[PDB]
Design a protein around this ligand. Structure first.
Ligand SMILES: Nc1nn(-c2cccc(-c3ccc4cc[nH]c4c3)c2)cc1-c1ccc2c(c1)CCNC2=O
Ligand SMILES: [Mg+2]
Length: 290
């Protein structure tokens, strides 16, 4: 199993691409821009990082993970001077489809089923598995980092952003972080709100209460709940591993999971004014778990 190493280009990227000023993101450590291949017109995205030890680590680890069908692909990396500062410029496959939960929030029908949730979870679990197998922990798995290739309902989900990723030899438990994220995302996919604690809106979870409230959880099986409790286990020493997760009947036979109708889409709309807080709660939480 032998892969090629990263070969950073030094020529000006503007020899190869038309670079616009429209900012497709204010990501973890750079900004993402819209660009076009000069000779093919084909669309791509560009991540700019000021060159430095962290930026070199993100790029390297992202390069190792690139060929995974559920991680955003790296096309090339340039080292250039950009507006007076030294940069790593990363050209990436273009990810048009929007973020994971915007798509679901926007479903016309409010017709999201448990089986769809399963299939999505399988996609994210494959990315984590690719990484964990080569001893990388992503450590930033969360909503804004999960994007679809295009707007086609047949679009592929891709994990992005290696700004917190690290190598994990000697340090197994660094991976638990990613598992906890799977649990949170799974939980949100099933009901439309995070399993978190805390004005004009419904309170989804009272402080300290049983974690699966009846209105939204009553038709979800105990089996699925056990799987969630395993992913959310407080102690990293007891939390489910990516191997156990990918061997679970609910993930393994995702396409034979019941099509139970879910509240998710409807809850995401009603609670939309709270989304940013949900993302913020998750981001802070991650800062203390990684
Ligand atoms: N690969 C990507 N494509 N788009 C994306 C998102 C929205 C529109 C377009 C887009 C849309 C049209 C055109 C035409 C030329 N280029 C285009 C790009 C591209 C965004 C990303 C991306 C890349 C890196 C990160 C993130 C997102 C999230 C945060 N952290 C990251 O590290
Ligand atoms: Mg890929």
């Amino acid at each position: 199993h032998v892969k090629s190493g990263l070969q950073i280009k030094k020529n000006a990227i503007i020899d190869d691409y038309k670079v616009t000023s429209q900012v497709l993101g204010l990501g973890i450590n750079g900004k993402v821009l819209q660009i076009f291949n000069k000779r093919t017109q084909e669309k791509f995205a560009l991540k700019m990082l000021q060159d430095c030890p962290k930026a070199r680590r993100e790029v390297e680890l992202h390069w190792r993970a690139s060929q995974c069908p559920h991680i955003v692909r790296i096309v090339d990396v340039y080292e250039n001077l950009y507006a007076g500062r030294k940069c790593l410029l990363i050209v990436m496959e273009c990810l048009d489809g929007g973020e994971l939960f915007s798509r679901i929030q926007d479903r016309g029908d409010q017709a999201f089923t448990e089986r769809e949730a399963s299939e999505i979870m399988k996609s994210i679990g494959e990315a984590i598995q690719y990484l964990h197998s080569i001893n990388i922990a992503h450590r930033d798995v969360k909503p804004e980092n999960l994007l679809y290739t295009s707007k086609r309902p047949n679009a592929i989900l891709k994990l992005t952003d290696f700004g917190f990723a690290k190598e994990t030899t000697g340090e197994k438990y660094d991976k638990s972080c990613d598992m906890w994220s799977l649990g949170v995302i799974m939980y949100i996919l099933l009901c439309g709100y995070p399993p978190f604690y805390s004005p004009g809106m419904k309170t989804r979870i009272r402080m300290g209460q049983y974690e699966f409230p009846n209105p939204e959880w009553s038709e979800v099986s105990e089996e699925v709940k056990m799987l969630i409790r395993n992913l959310l286990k407080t102690e990293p020493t007891q939390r489910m591993t990516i191997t156990e997760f990918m061997n679970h009947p609910w993930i393994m036979q995702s396409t034979k999971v019941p099509q139970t109708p879910l509240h998710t889409s409807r809850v995401l709309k009603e609670d939309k004014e709270r989304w940013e807080d949900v993302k913020e709660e998750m981001t802070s939480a991650l800062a203390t778990m990684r």
